[PDB]
Ligand binder design. Structure first.
Ligand SMILES: NC(=O)c1ccc[n+]([C@@H]2O[C@H](COP(=O)([O-])OP(=O)(O)OC[C@H]3O[C@@H](n4cnc5c(N)ncnc54)[C@H](O)[C@@H]3O)[C@@H](O)[C@H]2O)c1
Ligand SMILES: NC(=O)c1ccc[n+]([C@@H]2O[C@H](COP(=O)([O-])OP(=O)(O)OC[C@H]3O[C@@H](n4cnc5c(N)ncnc54)[C@H](O)[C@@H]3O)[C@@H](O)[C@H]2O)c1
Lengths: 280, 280
């Protein structure tokens, strides 16, 4: 495991959205750095599954039911973590994602759309708010709580998770795209804000990844690749979807001061060349 | 040494501009990956000094006098390297640099500058040509020679070296800024061109670094920064120059397929936050 190359013994990594697909994979690999891992998620059972796997594999982890949108809940969790492990060294803001209420059915408006089609005009204010809250405030509020504890600590840093959308928006998903542009911006803002007290901030922008959770979404109901999947492959030079494991190197690089002490305020694409391609 | 984390035993790393400040330092560290290192430079003595140090420490290196602008010379050197080590796995295009004839004395034009000041109007065509030749063709021609050999080799990849000045240009240095903008662009072009045959191409964009060779250029005022150095420091969030050591992590990240298999066409800033800040 390449994570074993990076000695983070006695450091505490706090990971939000830890029960999710990407973060649960990454959390399990980060255990091999010998760090203590706190797994924060609204879904305690999902995070606790990850904690059990880590502990069974010889690592050190614990799950904490947390709502990243509720500041005083995060603060309570921070106190429990202090009892169990200590205070934060590395914060990974993994909580995030999109939802159907802020997604259109159609790539483009048209003059001949079926009445059942959810268009731009059908997106609910609360759906848009939900996406921005989760993907921006859900990183900002944990950063307020845990960065306070990181102040002054050698090697402290923050990781946010951006998206291809932050570079150029994707069709159908305006709120998610806008919120990820905002978190890319916030990454740079934080890097500058904390630049005199030694907390770096960087982001990983994954490209198009596949997992067993989204595999079925890449096909229509008859098992043919969707037009969107075909467009993704067409506009990805390496001609494939990425895998979760392909984010691990970037994460280790950015969180390990021996590798990235002078790397700060970067949004690092891991995307098979997608953002380097014109389409032509 | 973190380079020892990355097993490149029996692979061949070809480094151009190897006798230079940054590349000589990085080549010495890459020897700890156990790769064979070929050190290419127009200054044989400078490259051979590095080869001797690497070999004395138990590494495997050889220097080769090369002009990266002369295709037939690069081809002859490629043949020599095949005899000594074999064929290229990883190419680092480190040859590059500016020329005083393509640089102004003044950051901005004014009326009634004295005759002695070298202004925009004094920039020499041959100096501008020199900078573009060295920084763009000086990467493209070795890539033509050595990528031919990398075809079919698992894990093969190309590294270019860009600059801050590629993102927005720096005062006084139009040609060097333009040529590095062009190599950033070429990095993306190569990534796409080789994307269906398994050769990644990425670039590192070092920010403002200090070395033994430029220390007395940055701190002239005995140990107070020069006016340019003060501009750099005030516009770098981390408030310091970078060191050669602080580029190694990024290099290892990008050249090791275990870390960066899906990272392609990226230009990675290593700059203390410079690119994330606008001075306000
Ligand atoms: N999956 C991808 O391919 C991909 C690509 C680019 C970016 N991202 C981003 O990566 C991050 C993780 O994505 P994912 O697909 O693995 O997510 P996921 O949907 O699989 O999991 C998200 C996790 O966040 C939890 N969560 C939701 N609301 C919460 C809240 N208020 N407080 C605490 N926890 C909450 C959920 O319970 C869940 O466990 C997100 O920021 C996502 O936007 C994902
Ligand atoms: N030094 C920095 O802080 C910095 C910052 C950003 C980018 N860069 C870029 O990093 C790379 C190395 O920079 P450096 O400062 O260490 O350079 P350097 O001037 O110290 O060394 C450059 C090397 O290239 C060799 N060279 C010149 N012309 C050649 C030719 N035609 N064929 C073969 N070799 C030739 C030189 O002999 C020299 O050894 C360059 O591309 C530079 O543009 C450097």
């Amino acid at each position: 495991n390449i994570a074993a190359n990076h000695n983070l013994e006695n450091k505490l990594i706090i990971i939000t959205g830890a029960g999710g697909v990407l973060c649960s994979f990454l959390a399990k690999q980060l255990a091999y750095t010998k760090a203590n891992i706190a797994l924060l998620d609204l879904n305690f059972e999902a995070a606790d599954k990850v904690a059990k796997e880590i502990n069974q594999s010889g690592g050190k982890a614990k799950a904490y039911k947390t709502n990243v949108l509720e500041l005083e809940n995060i603060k309570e969790v921070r106190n429990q973590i202090e009892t169990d492990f200590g205070t934060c060294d590395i914060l990974i803001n993994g909580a995030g994602g999109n939802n159907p209420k802020a997604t259109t059915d159609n790539e483009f408006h048209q003059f001949d759309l079926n009445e059942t089609t959810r268009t731009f005009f059908d997106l609910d204010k609360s759906g848009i708010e939900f996406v921005f809250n989760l993907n921006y405030l859900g990183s900002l509020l944990p950063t307020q709580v845990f960065a306070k504890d990181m102040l002054g600590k050698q090697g402290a840093n923050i990781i946010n998770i951006s998206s291809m959308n932050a570079f150029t928006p994707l069709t159908k998903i305006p709120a998610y795209s806008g919120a990820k542009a905002a978190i890319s911006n916030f990454t740079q803002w934080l890097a500058v804000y904390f630049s005199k007290v030694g907390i770096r901030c960087n982001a990983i922008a994954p490209g198009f990844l596949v997992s067993n959770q989204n595999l079925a979404l890449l096909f229509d109901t008859e098992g043919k690749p969707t037009d969107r999947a075909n467009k993704i492959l067409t506009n990805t030079p390496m001609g494939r979807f990425g895998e979760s494991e392909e984010l691990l190197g970037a994460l280790l690089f950015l969180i390990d001061e021996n590798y990235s002490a002078f790397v700060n305020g970067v949004v690092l694409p891991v995307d098979g060349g997608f953002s380097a391609y014109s389409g032509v």
